[PDB]
Amino acid sequence: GDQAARAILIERNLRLVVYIARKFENTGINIEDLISIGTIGLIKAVNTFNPEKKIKLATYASRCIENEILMYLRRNN
Amino acid sequence: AARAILIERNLRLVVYIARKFENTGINIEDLISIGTIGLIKAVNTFNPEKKIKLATYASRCIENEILMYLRRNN
Amino acid sequence: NGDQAARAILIERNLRLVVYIARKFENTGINIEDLISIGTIGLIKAVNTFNPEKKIKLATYASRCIENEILMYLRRNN
Amino acid sequence: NGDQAARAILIERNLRLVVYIARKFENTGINIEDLISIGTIGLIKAVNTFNPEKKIKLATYASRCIENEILMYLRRNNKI
Amino acid sequence: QAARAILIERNLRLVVYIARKFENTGINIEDLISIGTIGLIKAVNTFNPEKKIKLATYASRCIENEILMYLRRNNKI
Amino acid sequence: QAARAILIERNLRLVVYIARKFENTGINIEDLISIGTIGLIKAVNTFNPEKKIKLATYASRCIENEILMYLRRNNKIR
């Protein structure tokens, strides 16, 4: 029910995870870790997104994906 | 924490399972993302008293998530 | 129930959706007749559980439920 | 009641629907007068349960309720 | 009640007998039967299984009243 | 544990067999399969095994009834 609704929104924004993950890729930071971590942020975005406000999902998701990655990068120096 | 330890410690498992689907021609980046969803489902639904190890249960959930995604779109 | 009369209207209005989706799974050598039946079950579940004041259209939600029912049928029989 | 006035407006607005649907079911052994009354009960139920927040016309919804009352009446009286 | 349905269905003829006495207007008998049936439903929903007035007489009044109010609302009787 | 899908899957060809009976009705078979399936769903949800009637017997009655109601409602020859 609610699960299927979130799956639709998650799967439509997967490329957004990759796009942001590639920005943070460089020496020592493996892209495959960043895709996973970023995907976690996308899941958090879809679960907390409020469609009754004027921020589009892709913009709110971008913020959550970045945030998840930055906190991973700070946790692992 | 706790759950976040289990997830971060098994990110490589997603890559290992996703590479099994190389011959589908589907972008490995998308499979990894899809498989990560499977890994997060496995952690959220484990129950350690069922006598099944978390790595094997997660292997199933990761492979299954990818399989459903591939058949849903083929 | 008046709710069931409304659900019946939206199910019958969208039987074509079951066919359009069922026909995509024809390469998985299962009879189209079975796929329509299984897909219809997913349409019934969609209309029964759809939340109209959420932001997902009925056709989008029902396509997901029709797919999910077929995919569960394919995984049970493989 | 204000809500009674609103329901009255909607019932009277769709009485043509009762007659048209009843005429479709008129047959030998089935009195049109009975079908109009039975159909009118279906219309009353439609207006009392209709939800405008959904995406179904009242007329679409009413006609379904009208048909359903007439069908159950014919099944109940063994006129299938 | 489930017994409401029985009371209504076997008083359907009552609606016709009353509605037929108003077909000296310019309103179709079909609409009068529909309106009278509203009067019958109102009577059954507001009937007391007692008192010195019982179903048939109370239903006749409500059926006639609804038809009268429908015709007066459209400026006939 | 609650998987009643064994019952439903076992009666799918019953839907097609009944829907083929209306070959002479000008309704596409795809619609009749869906409508019949609705009938099978109602059968399994209201089947009483304590009564003396087999499920496939009761299921056929609801499958055919669902189709007949759909055809009457749409003014099609039965």
Residue numbers in the entry:
A (entry chain B): -2 to 74
B (entry chain C): 1 to 74
C (entry chain D): -3 to 74
D (entry chain A): -3 to 76
E (entry chain F): 0 to 76
F (entry chain E): 0 to 77
Manuscript excerpt for this entry:
Sigma (σ) factors are bacterial protein modules that plug into RNA polymerase (RNAP) to recruit the enzyme to specific programs of gene transcription via recognition of promoter DNA and the subsequent initiation of transcription. The vast majority of σ factors are members of the σ70 protein superfamily, which is subdivided into four classes based upon their extent of conservation and the presence/absence of the conserved σ domains (σ1.1, σ2, σ3, and σ4 connected by flexible loop regions) that mediate interactions with RNAP and/or promoter DNA. In B. subtilis there are four sigma factors known to control sporulation—the process in which the bacteria become long-lived dormant spores to survive stress conditions. The sigma factor “puppeteers” involved in this process are SigF in the forespore and SigE in the mother cell at the early phases; then, these are replaced by SigG and SigK, respectively, as sporulation progresses.
Here we present an experimentally solved X-ray crystal structure of SigE residues 17–133 and review all of the available experimentally-solved and AlphaFold-predicted B. subtilis sigma factor structures. Initially we produced almost full-length B. subtilis SigE (residues 17–239, only missing the initial prosequence that maintains SigE in an inactive state before processing), but we found that it degraded to a smaller domain that remained stable over time, as observed by SDS-PAGE and 2D NMR. Smaller constructs were designed based on predicted domain boundaries, and SigE17–133 was the variant that successfully yielded diffracting crystals. The first 27 residues of SigE are a pro-sequence that keeps the protein in the inactive state and ensures its localization to the mother cell. These residues get cleaved during sporulation by SpoIIGA to activate the protein. The constructs used in this study lack the first 17 residues as this maintains activity in vivo without requiring processing by SpoIIGA. Crystals grew over a period of 4–6 months and the protein likely lost some N-terminal amino acids during this process. It is also possible that these residues were too flexible to give rise to discernible electron density. The structure is a classic four helix-turn-helix core found in all sigma factor σ2 domains and covers regions σ2.1 (55–78), σ2.2 (79–97), and σ2.3 (98–117) of SigE, which includes the binding sites for both CsfB and the −10 promoter DNA sequence for transcriptional activation. The solved structure aligns very well (RMSD: 0.51 Å) with the AlphaFold prediction for SigE, with Alphafold providing a slight helix overprediction in the loop between two helices.
